[PDB]
Each structure stands twice: as structure tokens, then as C-alpha cells.
Design an enzyme around this catalytic site. Sequence first.
Site, mmCIF file in Angstrom:
data_model
loop_
_atom_site.group_PDB
_atom_site.id
_atom_site.type_symbol
_atom_site.label_atom_id
_atom_site.label_comp_id
_atom_site.label_asym_id
_atom_site.label_seq_id
_atom_site.Cartn_x
_atom_site.Cartn_y
_atom_site.Cartn_z
ATOM 1 C CB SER A 123 14.948 0.385 57.447
ATOM 2 O OG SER A 123 15.797 -0.628 58.610
ATOM 3 C CG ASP A 152 20.588 0.562 38.541
ATOM 4 O OD1 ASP A 152 20.478 0.304 39.997
ATOM 5 O OD2 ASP A 152 20.646 1.662 37.982
#
Length: 330
Positions: free
Chosen positions: A199, A35
Site C-alpha cells: 500500500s 481464505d
Amino acid sequence: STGSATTTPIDSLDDAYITPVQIGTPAQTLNLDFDTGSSDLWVFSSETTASEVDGQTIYTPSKSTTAKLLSGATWSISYGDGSSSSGDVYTDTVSVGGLTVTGQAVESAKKVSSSFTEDSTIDGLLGLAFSTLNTVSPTQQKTFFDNAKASLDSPVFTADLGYHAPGTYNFGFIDTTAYTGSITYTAVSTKQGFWEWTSTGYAVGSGTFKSTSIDGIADTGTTLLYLPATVVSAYWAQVSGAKSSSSVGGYVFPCSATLPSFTFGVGSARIVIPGDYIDFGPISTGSSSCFGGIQSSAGIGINIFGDVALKAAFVVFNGATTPTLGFASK
């Protein structure tokens, strides 16, 4: 040193991925959920409340000649999906894909929430976010990666998740055969303890690319792609009959649909998520309403590039002094 381990989807929907991990001496192999959105290595154990164990493999520290109680240390964690676990702490030898760390904090669960109990395939979590998020008190502990780092050939790990197929976590090297083209690296902020990046935009299907900054985290422990409501609405508007259902808990779409792809930007590069990756199947067995793999982050407080996004790429988690993230197509 290096390590290389195969990671395998837990079910037919790629809800999560498990990777075998050797703990203790002799080795006890547990299948852990790696994770990158948390920083605790915790396991089902001989200390876990019996009624909360249902099929998991447990770590038994008393059977490990190298286990030592980390006296006075406790831990307690809550995840974004509302699940939780807590317990005490041992140090022991931990190996992943041939890479060994001695003195790793292995957090033994005394209690786990229902979601963990109900998932017999996951024996615990191995956190790969920054150690500043580790929950051990009163002495915070380091992640497996942080402990391994100085010994690694290169201070990196890579995630290569499969779509309905096994993939690979590598430590200490970049497998140049595992991706196509070049890797595009992008800046990381560690301010919140995550692999947080920005992004450069998105496209829906064959549509034009929208240049827009989307801050979010690369999180292998989250199944879906969670993005701003504007972006998610633009995606689902291209699917006839798709709608947000408050009763179901997100966007659903007719199972008869063909889903468009979704592209996200990494610098000037583009990662394309095929439409099929966005199908999470019937909302309940036999339903003709299917659950979407792109959902709104509104009310999470952060955008999350979960498995839906990450599995479309070869992803480099560069833990050099100035961390960065790399993405390549594959």
C-alpha cells in the site's frame, strides 16, 4: 468457464463469510470459509473426532461415488489466530458457483481445534493463496483456483465482500457492474505464498494522506485490519477514550463514539473504509467498551488487509503468470 457464488457473513459482526461448495457425487454442499491467506481446502467430515463436531455439516467420502483416498497423504495446518486442524486426504469433484474441478484434493479433518468446533456455521476452509503454502505431505496439492485456472476464461477470481450483507466470489471473469470507477492494479510478491502487496499510504478521517509504503497481505480469512503500530496509534488517537487494552487484547473504544473513516492507498488510488466498518461492538455482552476493527500487527510479523479493508473494495486476485491485485471502489 466461470463460476459465481454468493458469500454470506456468519454473524452480525461480519466475523467471517461462508460460501456454499458442492463436493462429491451426488453433491454434498458444505459452507466453506474462502481464505486468500491459506492454501488448503479442508472440511469437517465423517472422520472428524466426534467430540469436536458441534453442528457443522460433514463431508462423507464413502457416500461419494467420485471420492478416492489419496493414499498416504496427510495434512496439518496452524493459522495466525492459533487455531489448527489436521487429517488425511481424498480427491473428489468440487464445484463453486457452477465451476467444477475434478480431482481436487479435499482434506478431511480428523482433528480440529476448539475455535473450529465452536463455530457451527463454518464447515471448513477453501484456501485461495498460492499452492506453495499447501500443507499436504508428502505430495503437496493445488488449490481449487490453481486447478481451475487453465479452464477459466481469464485466470482471475474476485472478492466482493459485503458490509453486514452478502457479497460475491467470482471465478474467471471481472463483473464490470460490481464496482465504480476504475480498477487500480498493484504488484504482488509470491515469495511468502501470499497475495502480498504494498500500500502507498493512509489517511485518518478527513486528515491529510501520509505517503508511506505498507507491505501486507490481502487476506479474506482474517476479520480485521492489522497495520503497523504507528499507523494504528494515529487512527485511535482520533477517537476520544480509545486505548490499547492488554487485558482485552487490542484497541477498545467507548461504544458511544463515532469512528472516523480510514483510507488506504493503492498506487495513486484511495480506498475509504467507513468508520462503521471499524466497529466490532461490545467486548462482552452489554459492555460499553467496544472492540476496534483496526489493530496493531506488531508481533504478527506481517500486516494484514483483512475483511475490514477488503469489504470496502471490489478486489481482483489476478493469477496470471505475473500475479497482481486490483482494487476498485464500489
